[PDB]
Amino acid sequence: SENKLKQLNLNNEWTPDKLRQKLQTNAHNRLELPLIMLSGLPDTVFEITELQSLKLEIIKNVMIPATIAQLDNLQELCLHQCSVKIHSAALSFLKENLKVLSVKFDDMRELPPWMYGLRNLEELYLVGSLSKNVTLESLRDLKSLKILSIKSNVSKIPQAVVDVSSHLQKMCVHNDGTKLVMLNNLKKMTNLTELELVHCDLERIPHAVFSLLSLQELDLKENNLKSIEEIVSFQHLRKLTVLKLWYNSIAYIPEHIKKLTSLERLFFSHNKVEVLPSHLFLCNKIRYLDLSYNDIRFIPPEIGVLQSLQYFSITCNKVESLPDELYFCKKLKTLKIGKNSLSVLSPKIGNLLFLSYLDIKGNHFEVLPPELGDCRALKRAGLVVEDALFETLPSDVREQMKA
């Protein structure tokens, strides 16, 4: 008797107007309705047929009724610290329709056991503790799973993921620093194209990565990497274009990196690099190069050979001079000089006709070159500088950049 009146007072309060007031567009380009502290699920929720995602936060003892079948445009479900039970027809609807799922559990209490039966699920995001052996059930009935992201404290890639190896394409594990010591199952992730082993305390590039011949992107963030001479084995991965070694302790970029033929995006920010060698710029197909938060002092002239370079960042280094050959990278779209030790800015920056973002705040400039007006895509909103330095620009250069 009390439960009926409870839901009556939830449905009375949450009318479709006040519910649609909370409608927004989420990070996955979907129309989402966020519920944050309710006593349950209002039945009126199933009248908002236009919503594409349903986000539940801190709602304990939730039951999804069969009226969930009314949400004809339902592709995503989000659970933050929620204990959710489903109806039979509700689970059938979610099995045939739910495509993206994101669950955050403080305890195993909030990880729904029905999630393992959603075959039409394409993306799965878990943020919670799953550990010896992972307490993840076999992803056996996720027949269409493509992206898996596990945020945990896990020491081994669970065998549960080996049951999705035939069609899984992107796997992300961002552990809390717990060392991933058993990497054997990663060898069975054949059809993987993007891999993220972040903050796993690996300490060396793992051998298993060299088994993913179809791998294109790689993220090894926050793993205390000091020696990366295993880059040699990456020439066995002939389709690798994105290689992220950022947030490590690397001080020496070996010559073997020049043999990474298909390299285009190189993430080397937040390392211990003091000298960037000549051969680093023999990877002529590089578009993205972030070397920020290092001890770089000189930029080599050979960077001029990177004719396809569009993104370059050396913020928070010890750079004292920039080579003029840098302004041969005529496709430069973003230049982040940032907090260095530059005394003068070359007029040849006018050659970068595509430059749209420049950050030179925190340097040793005395006057800015007028040829900054030749960068037709660069605006003051996209130009980071000391306002006193921006005053050194010619008057109409100033106005043309502001309007």
Author numbering: 396 to 526, 531 to 802
Wording from the paper:
These membrane proteins consist of heteromeric assemblies of LRRC8 subunits, whose compositions determine permeation properties. VRACs are composed of proteins belonging to the conserved LRRC8 family, whose expression is restricted to chordates. This family contains five members in humans, termed LRRC8A–E. All of them share a close sequence relationship and consist of an N-terminal pore domain (PD) followed by a cytoplasmic leucine-rich repeat domain (LRRD).
As for the LRRD of the A subunit, LRRC8CLRRD is a monomeric protein in solution.
